[PDB]
Design a protein around this ligand. Structure first.
Ligand SMILES: CCCCCCCCCCCCCCCCCC(=O)OC[C@H](COP(=O)([O-])OCC[N+](C)(C)C)OC(=O)CCCCCCCCCCCCCCCCC
Ligand SMILES: CCCCCCCCCCCCCCCCCC(=O)OC[C@H](COP(=O)([O-])OCC[N+](C)(C)C)OC(=O)CCCCCCCCCCCCCCCCC
Ligand SMILES: CCCCCCCCCCCCCCCCCC(=O)OC[C@H](COP(=O)([O-])OCC[N+](C)(C)C)OC(=O)CCCCCCCCCCCCCCCCC
Ligand SMILES: CCCCCCCCCCCCCCCCCC(=O)OC[C@H](COP(=O)(O)OCCN)OC(=O)CCCCCCCCCCCCCCCCC
Ligand SMILES: CCCCCCCCCCCCCCCCCC(=O)OC[C@H](COP(=O)(O)OCCN)OC(=O)CCCCCCCCCCCCCCCCC
Ligand SMILES: CCCCCCCCCCCCCCCCCC(=O)OC[C@H](COP(=O)(O)OCCN)OC(=O)CCCCCCCCCCCCCCCCC
Ligand SMILES: CCCCCCCCCCCCCCCCCC(=O)OC[C@H](COP(=O)(O)OCCN)OC(=O)CCCCCCCCCCCCCCCCC
Ligand SMILES: CCCCCCCCCCCCCCCCCC(=O)OC[C@H](COP(=O)(O)OCCN)OC(=O)CCCCCCCCCCCCCCCCC
Ligand SMILES: CCCCCCCCCCC1=C(C)C(=O)C(OC)=C(OC)C1=O
Ligand code: SF4
Lengths: 110, 314, 169, 42, 105, 156, 80, 98, 70
C-alpha cells in the first residue's frame, strides 16, 4: 500500500522534472537551426564479441538464479547434501568459466 | 503522514546530489594543488544553484531522434530507479521494511541499464549506439560479480533483510571476516556506477550525446544519486554502526559519517589513476575478479558449517 | 474497486500482451514485453510470491530482456495498418470479455470462470514463523538433488553449445 | 514432375554449401589539432 | 516405454514432488491434503478403469477442494439475492456485517 | 511599475546564473592554447570562478579560439560553432585569432576569426598572458552581467 | 612438481589463491569436528508445535512435563 | 474457477497467435515465444501459491532457467542467420524448398 | 586552506542526516511513542491483528495489560 504510493510519487516527481527540463526552453524563441558520428552513413558492423559476452552473462545469470536460495537452504537438517549440492553448483560455474577461458572465448575482450 | 516521510526522503537526496557536485569540485581542486569554486558564494556555496539555473535555461539540442518515446522514457527510468533504491535502506529504520530488500536492490540495479540502452538507441548516431552497447556490456558483466559477492556476504547474515544487517555487526564489523569480498565489492560498485578508472564514455562518444542540457543534467543527477546510494549500501554491508533503540540519532550520525567518508574515497580514487582500456577491465573482471569471487563464495558457504555458526533464519 | 486489484493488473497484463504481440517493431515489442513482465510480477507479488516476483525482475527483466534488447540493437537498423488493426481487435475482444464477465458474474469459453473478486480463494490461516514459498525454494539443495544435477548439466552444455555454433567452424 | 510453380527450383549444391553472399571506417575530425582516418576491424 | 529405473535401483529421483500429499518440509500441510489422501487410498491397486467409476465421489470432493466452483457459485447466488433484496428495500444488513461488531479476541 | 521591477530582478537572476557558470570549450590550435593551459594551472585557477576545465562542445557556453585559424581549419570551426546551444559567446585569444598576427599576409591563414564567427571579446597579445586571458574572461562576465533581455522583451 | 608451484605462484598468484581457497573449502568441512554441532543445532530448532502423544501406559522416556528430567537436553548448546 | 486464470489463459493465447503468424522479423517470433513462457510462469506460480503446494515452489525457477537457455540458443541462431544474410527477415530462410 | 571543503561536506551531512531522523521521529510519533512493529511473518501479523482487535480502539499500538482481566 505504502510501497506503491512511494513508487507513484517517485514516478510523478521524475516525470515532473523531465517535463520542466524539456518544455521550459521551448517557451524561449531563440532561433531556427538547419544543421546540414565519425562515420557518415556506414552500417553498424556486427561483432560476435559483444554478443558472446552478452550470452555468457545471461548463462551465468541463470546459474546465479540457481545459486540464490543458499542462505535459506543452509538451515536444512540435511547439511551434507546441501553442502555437496552447493559446492557442485559453484564448481559447475567454475568449469563453465574455465571452458570459456581455454577455448579463446574471452579474447580481445578478455 | 506517510507522504511527509516520502518527501523528506526524496528532497534531501536531490540536495545532497547538488552539494556532492560542489564537494567533488572543491576536493579535486584541493587535491590538484588549487582551489575549487570560491567566488560565486562564500566558499562556493552558491555554485550548484547557479549551475542548475544555467542548465535549465539552456537551449535544447532538438535532435532527429528515431523514437521520441524512449527518448522521453530513458531519463524517467533513470530518475525513478535512482530514487526508488533508497526506500529499504535502514537509517536505522527503513522507510519500507522489506523482507527481501537486498534482492530488491539487486533487481533495481539490474533494471538500471535500460536507460543506457534506450538513450543509445534513441540517438541517431551509430557511434553513440556503439558506446552505449559497450557501456551496457561492462555494466552487466559487473552485475555478475555484484550478485556473487552479495550472495557470499549474506551467508553470515542469514536472510535478505537489510535491518538484520545491523544486528549481525553488533559485535564486530563485517569487513573483518570478509575483507577480500569488501575490496572486490568496492571495485565492482566503482565500476558499476561508471566512475573512474572505469568511466570509458569520457575517454577516446557517450550514450547521451544528443540529449539536451536539461536531460543531461537529470542523467548526471541520477548517476550521483546512484553513487551516494551505493556508498550507503556498502557502509551498511561492511561497516555497520552501533544502534541504540532509544536513540536512533546515534546510528544516523555514525553511518552518515562513514558513508560520506566512503564517497570522499570515491572522489579520491577518481583523481589518482589513469583510465582502463575496455579489454583491460574485461580482463580484470572475467579473469581476475570472477575466479576469486567463486572461490570465496565456496569458502563462505562451507565455512559456517564447519564452525557451527549458522546464522538464525529469522 | 480496490478488491479487484489483481483482476485489474491481469487486464493490464493481457493488454500489454496484445500490444506487443501485434509486432510493431522488435524494440517496441521488447518494451511492451518489459511492461507486461513488470505487471505480471506485480500480480505475483499481490498474490504473496515475493521471491518469485523478485526472480522475475532480477532474471527475466534485468538479466534476459537486456540480452534481447541488446541483440535487437545490433540488428534492425533504425529509421502500420496491420499492427493497428490487430491491436484494435484484440482490445475489442478483451473488453468484450471483461463486460461479459462483470455483467453476469460467470462466463464460459473453454473452461467455466467466475466473475467475483479473486480474494475469495485465499487461505484463512497463518504460516507460522516462516514463509512457505521460501522453504519450498530452499528445499532445492536438500530434496531436489536430481533437479540440481540435470539443470546444472543443461546449463554447462548450453554454454558449450553456444560457444560451438557461433564460431563458424 | 516439374510444374509451373516448380520452375525456379534449382537443385541443391553438390557439397551442399551456399556462397556466403570489409571493415569499419571512422573519420575522426578536428573537433594541437589533427584529423585521422581510421580503418578499424572491431 | 516407461523403464522404471527408480524402482529397479531403489533410488528416489522425482517421487517426492509427484503428489501434493507427500512429505513436505517443516510438516507444512496443503489446502487439500485430506481429499487427496482419500482419493489416493481409493485408487491404489485397482487400476485406472476401476478407479474411474468405483469411488468417483472422492475425486469429486478433491476437485471441489482444488477449484471450488460450487462454493463460488453458491456465494454468487447468495450475494445476488442479497443485492436484489437490498435494492428492492426489504432487507436491512445486521450491525456485525457492516463493521460494528468489535470482534472476539 | 511592478512589472518592470519583476523583469529587472529576474534579469539580474538569470544574468547572475549565466555569468557565474561559464563552461568553456577551447580550440587547441597553437601557442595560445598552451597559455590557456597555463591559465588553468593552480596559480590562476580558472575553475574557482565557476569556469570549468575543458567542457564538452555540446554543453559549453563560451568558445575560446586560441591559435591560428588556417584555411583548412575554418569550416570545421564554423561547424563546431553552429552546434553550440544558445546563449553562446566567442573569445578571440592572441593576434592570430584577432587579425592574423605574424602570418597575416600568408596564403593559407584566415585574417582574423571574426571573418567566420561573431566575436565578443578580443584578447591582445602574442601570447597574451594567463593574467590577460583571465581579465578577458572576467570582462566577458561583466558584459553578460549588463544584459537586458527581459527588459527588452517587456518593452517590445 | 615443486618448482611448478613456485613458478605458477610467481606468475598467476590470483589463480593459485583461488584454487587454494577452493581446496580448503572442499576438504575442511569433512575434517572439522564442529559439523555435527551444526547438524544438531539445525535439528534442535523448534519451528512447529511439539504435538503430545496419548499416554497408553508404556512411555518411560517421554516426559509428562517440560521440567521433567527425561527428554532431550540442550545443555551442550548452552555451554558449547 | 477464478478470473485471473482466465486472463492468463487469454494472454497465453494472444502470445501464441502472435508467434504462429510471423510478420517480418524473427525477433518478433522470439519475443512472442518468450511472452508465452512468461504467461506459463505466472499461471503455474499462481496455481502453486494458491494450492499451498510447498515443494512445487521450485518449479517456476527451473522453468525460467530452461526457457532462458532456449532463448539464448535462439538468439545465437538469429545472430548466425543475420550474419549470413545481413538481416533477420523470415523470407530469406527459403533455400530448403528445393 | 583544506578546511574550506568543510561547509559543503557539512551541508551534505545535514541532508543525509535528515531522512533517517525524520523516519525515526515519524515512526515513533505515529505508533504511540514506540517503534514501528515489524511483521515479516504471518505469526507476527496475526499477533498484530489480535492486538488491534483486543485494543477496543481499532488501533494496534494501544496496548492493554493487567487492567483488563477480571
Ligand atoms: C528551479 C530550477 C531552475 C528553474 C528555471 C530558472 C529560474 C528562472 C525562470 C524564469 C527565467 C526567465 C524566463 C526564461 C528565460 C528567458 C531568457 C530569454 O531568452 O529571454 C528572452 C525571451 C524572448 O524575448 P525576445 O522577444 O526579446 O526574443 C529574443 C529572441 N528573438 C528576437 C530571436 C525572437 O523571453 C521569453 O521567452 C520570456 C519568457 C517568460 C519571461 C518571464 C515570465 C515570468 C517568469 C517568472
Ligand atoms: C570498502 C572498503 C575499502 C575497499 C578498498 C578501497 C581503497 C583501495 C582502492 C584501491 C585502488 C582502486 C582503483 C583501481 C581499481 C582497479 C585495479 C584493481 O583493483 O585490480 C585488482 C587486481 C587485479 O589483478 P592483476 O590484474 O594485477 O593480476 C595479474 C593477472 N595477470 C598476470 C593475468 C595479468 O587484483 C585482484 O583482482 C585481487 C583482488 C583481491 C584479492 C584478495 C585476496 C585475499 C587473500 C587470499 C589468500 C592469499 C594467500 C594464499 C592462499 C592461502 C590459503 C590459506
Ligand atoms: C555428479 C553427481 C554428484 C552428486 C551425487 C549425489 C550425492 C548425494 O548427496 O546423494 C545423496 C542425495 C540425498 O540423499 P539423502 O540421504 O540426503 O536424502 C534423504 C531423503 N530426502 C531427500 C527425502 C531428504 O541423493 C540421493 O540419495 C538420490 C538423488 C541423487 C542420486 C544420484 C544421481 C546421479 C546422477 C549422475 C548422472
Ligand atoms: C539544507 C541546507 C541547504 C543550504 C543551501 C544554501 C547554502 C548557501 C546559503 C547562502 C550562503 C550565503 C549567500 C549570500 C549571497 C549574497 C547576499 C548579499 O549580500 O547579496 C547582495 C546582493 C547585492 O545587494 P545590493 O543591495 O545591490 O548591495 C548594495 C549595498 N552595499 O543582493 C543580491 O544579490 C540580491 C539578494 C540575494 C540574497 C541571497 C541570499 C542567499 C540565498 C540562498 C539560497 C538557498 C537558501 C537555503 C535553501 C534551503 C534551506 C531552506
Ligand atoms: C517578484 C519579485 C521577485 C522576482 C524574481 C526574483 C527572485 C529572486 C532572484 C535572486 C535575487 C535577485 C538578484 C540577483 C543578483 C543581483 C545582484 C548581483 O549581481 O549581485 C552580485 C553579487 C556578487 O557580485 P559579483 O559581480 O559576482 O562579484 C564577484 C566578486 N568580485 O552576487 C551575490 O552576492 C550573490 C547573488 C545571489 C543571488 C540569489 C541566490 C540565488 C538564487 C536563489 C533563488 C532561485 C534558485 C533557487 C534554487 C533552485 C534550485 C537550484
Ligand atoms: C516505461 C514504463 C515506466 C518505467 C518507470 C516506472 C517503472 C520502473 C521503476 C519502478 C519499479 C518498481 C518495482 C516494484 C516491485 C518491486 C518488488 C516489490 O514490490 O518488493 C517489495 C515487497 C516484497 O517484499 P516483502 O518484504 O516480502 O513484502 C512484504 C512482506 N511482509 O512487495 C510488496 O510490498 C508488494 C506490494 C503489493 C504489490 C505491488 C505491485 C506494484 C505495481 C506493479 C509493478 C509496477 C511497475 C510496472 C512497470 C515495470 C517496468 C516497465
Ligand atoms: C581442485 C580444487 C577445486 C577446483 C574447483 C574450484 C576452482 C575455483 C577457481 C575457478 C577458476 C576458473 C578459471 C580457471 C582457469 C585456469 C586455466 C587458465 O587460465 O590457464 C591459462 C593460464 C596461463 O595464462 P595464459 O594462457 O597466458 O592466459 C592469459 C592470461 N595470462 O594457466 C595458468 O595460469 C595455470 C593454471 C593451472 C594451474 C594452477 C595451479 C594452482 C595450484 C594451487 C595450489 C593447490 C590447490 C589445491 C587444488 C589442486 C590444484 C591442482
Ligand atoms: C483467425 C486466426 C487469427 C486470429 C487472430 C487474428 C488477429 C487479427 C489479424 C487480422 C489479419 C491481419 C493480417 O493480415 O495479418 C498478417 C500479418 C503478417 O503479414 P505482414 O507481413 O505483417 O503483412 C502482410 C499483410 N497481409 O500477421 C500479423 O500481423 C499477426 C498478428 C497477430 C495478432 C493477434 C492479436 C490478438 C487477436 C485476438 C486474440 C486471438
Ligand atoms: C532539481 C534539480 C536540481 C539541480 C540539478 C542537479 C545539480 C546540478 C548539476 C550541475 C553540474 C555541475 C555543478 C558540475 O560541476 C558538472 O561538472 C562535473 C556537471 O556535469 C557536466 C553538472 O551537470
Ligand atoms: S598569437 Fe602568437 S602566441 Fe598566439 S598562436 Fe599566434 S604566434 Fe602563437
Amino acid at each position: 500500500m505504502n510501497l506503491m504510493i512511494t513508487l507513484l510519487t517517485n514516478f510523478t516527481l521524475a516525470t515532473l522534472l523531465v517535463t520542466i527540463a524539456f518544455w521550459l526552453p521551448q517557451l524561449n524563441v531563440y532561433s531556427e537551426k538547419t544543421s546540414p558520428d565519425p562515420m557518415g552513413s556506414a552500417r553498424l558492423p556486427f561483432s560476435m564479441k559483444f554478443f558472446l559476452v552478452a550470452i555468457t552473462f545471461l548463462l551465468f545469470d541463470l546459474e546465479i538464479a540457481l545459486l540464490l536460495p543458499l542462505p535459506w537452504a543452509s538451515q536444512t537438517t540435511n547439511l551434507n547434501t546441501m553442502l555437496t549440492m552447493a559446492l557442485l553448483l559453484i564448481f559447475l560455474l567454475a568449469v563453465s568459466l574455465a571452458y570459456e577461458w581455454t577455448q579463446k572465448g574471452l579474447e580481445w575482450t578478455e | 503522514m506517510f507522504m511527509i516521510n516520502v518527501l523528506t526522503l526524496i528532497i534531501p537526496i536531490l540536495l545532497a546530489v547538488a552539494f556532492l557536485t560542489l564537494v567533488e569540485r572543491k576536493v579535486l581542486g584541493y587535491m590538484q594543488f588549487r582551489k575549487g569554486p570560491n567566488v560565486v558564494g562564500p566558499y562556493g556555496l552558491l555554485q550548484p544553484i547557479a549551475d542548475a539555473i544555467k542548465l535549465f535555461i539552456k537551449e535544447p539540442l532538438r535532435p532527429a531522434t528515431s523514437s521520441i518515446s524512449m527518448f522521453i522514457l530513458a531519463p524517467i527510468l533513470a530518475l525513478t530507479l535512482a530514487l526508488t533504491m533508497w526506500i529499504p535502506l535502514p537509517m536505522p529504520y527503513p522507510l519500507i521494511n522489506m523482507n527481501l530488500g537486498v534482492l530488491f536492490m539487486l533487481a533495481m540495479s539490474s533494471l538500471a541499464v535500460y536507460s543506457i540502452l534506450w538513450s543509445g538507441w534513441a540517438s541517431n548516431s551509430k557511434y553513440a549506439l556503439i558506446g552505449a552497447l559497450r557501456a551496457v556490456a561492462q555494466t552487466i558483466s559487473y552485475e555478475v560479480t555484484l550478485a556473487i559477492i552479495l550472495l557470499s556476504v549474506l551467508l553470515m547474515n542469514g536472510s535478505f533483510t537489510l535491518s538484520t544487517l545491523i544486528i549481525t555487526q553488533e559485535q564486530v564489523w563485517l569487513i573483518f571476516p570478509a575483507w577480500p569480498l569488501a575490496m572486490m565489492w568496492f571495485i565492482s560498485t566503482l565500476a558499476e556506477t561508471n566512475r573512474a578508472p572505469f568511466d570509458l564514455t569520457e575517454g577516446e562518444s557517450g550514450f547521451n550525446v544528443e540529449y539536451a542540457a536539461g536531460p543531461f543534467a537529470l542523467f548526471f543527477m541520477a548517476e550521483y544519486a546512484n553513487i551516494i546510494m551505493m556508498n550507503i549500501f556498502t557502509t551498511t554491508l561492511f561497516l555497520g554502526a552501533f544502534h541504540n533503540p532509544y536513540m536512533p540519532e546515534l546510528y544516523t550520525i555514525n553511518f552518515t559519517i562513514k558513508s560520506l567518508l566512503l564517497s570522499i574515497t570515491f572522489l579520491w580514487i577518481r583523481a589518482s589513476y589513469p583510465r582502463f582500456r575496455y579489454d583491460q577491465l574485461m580482463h580484470l573482471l572475467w579473469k581476475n575478479f570472477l575466479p576469486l569471487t567463486l572461490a570465496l563464495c565456496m569458502w563462505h558457504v562451507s565455512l559456517p558449517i564447519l564452525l557451527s555458526s549458522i546464522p538464525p533464519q529469522t | 474497486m480496490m478488491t479487484y486489484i489483481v483482476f485489474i493488473l491481469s487486464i493490464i497484463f493481457v493488454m500489454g500482451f496484445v500490444g506487443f504481440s501485434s509486432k510493431p517493431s522488435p524494440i517496441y515489442g521488447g518494451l511492451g514485453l518489459i511492461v507486461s513482465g513488470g505487471v505480471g510480477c506485480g500480480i505475483v507479488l499481490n498474490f504473496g510470491g515475493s521471491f518469485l516476483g523478485l526472480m522475475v525482475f532480477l532474471i527475466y527483466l534485468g538479466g534476459m530482456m537486456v540480452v534481447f534488447g541488446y541483440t535487437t540493437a545490433m540488428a534492425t537498423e533504425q529509421y502500420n495498418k496491420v499492427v493497428l488493426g490487430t491491436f484494435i481487435t484484440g482490445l475489442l475482444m478483451e473488453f468484450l470479455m471483461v463486460y461479459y464477465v462483470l455483467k453476469d458474474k460467470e462466463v464460459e469459453i473453454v473452461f467455466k470462470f467466475n466473475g467475483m473478486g479473486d480474494w475469495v480463494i485465499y487461505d484463512t490461516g497463518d504460516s507460522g514463523f516462516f514463509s512457505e514459498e521460501a522453504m519450498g525454494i530452499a528445499a532445492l539443495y536438500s530434496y531436489g538433488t536430481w533437479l540440481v544435477i540435470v539443470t546444472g548439466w543443461s546449463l554447462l552444455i548450453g554454454v558449450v553449445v553456444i560457444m560451438e555454433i557461433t564460431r563458424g567452424n | 514432375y516439374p510444374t509451373k510453380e516448380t520452375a525456379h527450383w534449382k537443385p541443391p549444391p553438390w557439397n551442399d554449401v551456399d556462397p556466403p553472399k570489409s571493415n569499419l571506417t571512422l573519420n575522426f575530425g578536428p573537433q594541437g589539432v589533427l584529423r585521422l582516418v581510421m580503418e578499424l576491424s572491431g | 516405454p516407461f523403464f522404471d529405473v527408480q524402482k529397479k535401483l531403489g533410488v528416489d529421483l522425482d517421487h517426492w514432488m509427484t503428489i501434493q500429499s507427500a512429505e513436505q518440509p517443516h510438516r507444512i500441510p496443503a489446502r487439500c491434503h485430506a481429499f487427496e489422501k482419500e482419493w489416493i487410498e481409493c485408487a491404489h491397486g485397482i487400476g485406472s478403469i476401476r478407479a474411474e467409476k468405483e469411488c468417483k465421489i472422492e475425486f469429486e470432493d478433491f476437485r471441489e477442494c482444488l477449484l471450488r466452483q460450487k462454493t463460488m457459485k453458491r456465494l454468487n447466488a447468495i450475494k445476488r439475492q442479497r443485492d436484489k433484496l437490498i435494492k428492492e428495500g426489504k432487507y436491512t444488513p445486521p450491525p456485525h456485517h457492516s463493521g460494528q461488531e468489535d470482534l472476539r479476541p | 511599475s511592478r512589472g518592470e521591477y519583476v523583469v529587472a530582478k529576474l534579469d539580474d537572476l538569470i544574468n547572475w546564473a549565466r555569468r557565474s557558470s561559464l563552461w568553456p570549450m577551447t580550440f587547441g590550435l597553437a601557442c595560445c592554447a598552451v597559455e590557456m593551459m597555463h591559465m588553468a594551472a593552480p596559480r590562476y585557477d580558472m575553475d574557482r570562478f565557476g569556469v570549468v576545465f575543458r567542457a564538452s562542445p555540446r554543453q559549453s557556453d563560451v568558445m575560446i579560439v586560441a591559435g591560428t585559424l588556417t584555411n583548412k581549419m575554418a569550416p570545421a570551426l564554423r561547424k563546431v560553432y553552429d552546434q553550440m546551444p544558445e546563449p553562446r559567446y566567442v573569445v578571440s585569444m592572441g593576434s592570430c585569432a584577432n587579425g592574423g598576427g605574424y602570418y597575416h599576409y600568408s596564403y593559407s591563414v584566415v585574417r582574423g576569426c571574426d571573418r567566420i564567427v561573431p566575436v565578443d571579446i578580443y584578447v591582445p597579445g602574442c601570447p597574451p598572458t594567463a593574467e590577460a586571458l583571465l581579465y578577458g574572461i572576467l570582462q566577458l562576465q561583466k558584459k553578460i552581467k549588463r544584459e537586458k533581455r527581459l527588459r527588452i522583451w517587456y518593452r517590445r | 612438481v615443486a618448482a611448478f608451484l613456485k613458478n605458477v605462484w610467481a606468475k598467476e598468484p590470483v589463480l593459485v589463491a583461488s584454487f587454494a581457497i577452493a581446496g580448503l573449502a572442499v576438504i575442511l568441512p569433512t575434517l572439522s569436528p564442529y559439523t555435527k554441532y551444526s547438524l544438531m543445532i539445525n535439528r534442535a530448532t523448534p519451528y512447529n508445535y511439539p504435538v503430545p502423544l496419548r499416554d497408553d501406559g508404556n512411555m518411560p522416556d517421554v516426559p509428562s512435563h517440560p521440567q521433567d528430567p527425561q527428554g532431550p537436553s540442550l545443555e551442550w548448546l548452552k555451554r558449547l | 474457477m477464478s478470473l485471473v486464470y482466465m486472463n492468463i489463459m487469454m494472454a497465453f493465447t494472444v502470445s501464441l497467435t502472435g508467434l504462429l503468424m510471423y510478420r517480418s522479423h524473427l525477433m518478433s517470433s522470439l519475443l512472442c515465444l518468450e511472452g508465452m513462457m512468461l504467461s506459463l510462469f505466472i499461471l503455474a506460480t499462481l496455481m502453486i501459491l494458491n494450492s499451498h503446494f510447498t515443494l512445487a515452489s521450485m518449479m517456476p525457477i527451473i522453468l525460467l532457467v530452461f526457457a532462458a537457455c532456449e532463448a539464448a540458443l535462439g538468439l545465437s541462431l538469429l545472430v548466425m542467420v543475420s550474419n549470413t544474410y545481413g538481416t533477420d527477415y523470415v523470407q530469406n530462410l527459403n533455400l530448403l524448398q528445393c | 586552506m583544506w578546511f574550506e571543503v568543510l561547509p559543503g561536506i557539512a551541508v551534505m551531512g545535514v541532508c543525509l542526516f535528515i531522512p533517517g531522523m525524520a523516519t525515526a521521529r515519524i515512526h515513533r510519533f505515529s505508533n504511540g511513542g514506540r517503534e514501528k512493529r515489524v511483521a515479516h511473518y504471518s505469526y507476527q501479523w496475526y499477533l498484530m491483528e489480535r492486538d488491534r482487535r483486543v485494543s477496543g480502539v481499532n488501533r494496534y499500538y494501544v496496548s492493554k495489560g493487567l487492567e483488563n482481566i477480571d
